[PDB]
A paper describes a structure:
RNase H cleaves the phosphodiester bonds of RNA in double-stranded DNA/RNA hybrids, leaving 3′-hydroxyl and 5′-phosphate groups at each cleaved site. Structural analyses found that the DEDD motif coordinates the divalent cation at the active site, acting as metal ligands, and constitutes the pivotal scaffold for the catalytic reaction. In addition to the highly conserved DEDD motif, a histidine adjacent to the active site (His124 in E. coli RNase HI) in the loop structure between β5 and α5 has also frequently been discussed.
In the RNH_Mg_2 structure an Mg2+ ion is bound in a different position to those in the other two structures, RNH_Mg_1 and RNH_Mg_3, which are very similar to each other. The exact reason for the observed variation in the binding of the Mg2+ ion is unknown.
Numbering used by the authors: 1 to 155
Amino acid sequence: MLKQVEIFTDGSCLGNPGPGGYGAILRYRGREKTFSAGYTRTTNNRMELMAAIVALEALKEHCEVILSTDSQYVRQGITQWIHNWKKRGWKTADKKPVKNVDLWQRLDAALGQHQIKWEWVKGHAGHPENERCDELARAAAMNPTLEDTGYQVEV
Ligand SMILES: [Mg+2]
Ligand SMILES: [Mg+2]
């Protein structure tokens, strides 16, 4: 029996690129734990990944994780893209580098540590933990303290 935990994630960004942040909630037994940090120039999609990465890397043993997010980008990557990446060596079909490969690879490493059941959510409405993660992410985007060193500036 693996430890059973719940993770909720969201990203937020004031531009594209602009200041942004991530928010994550990790719930196990009774102890609830929040994660957030703000970055001076990033994208929403990079913050969506960081939220999952940071919450997963926090786990210090093999767990059964229920991971809830409304990110259509993470969903597309998890369910549509990463299988192609793993047989093409993390390049596109045209042999080009994959966008955000630094975070996708880091997320995939953390994903391999646990038994993940993904819960895709249509929207914040009717999901209080996912809306709290948006609040956490937005709060960090309004008070950025770090640089997103992996963001390759597209502008
Ligand atoms: Mg989001
Ligand atoms: Mg958001």
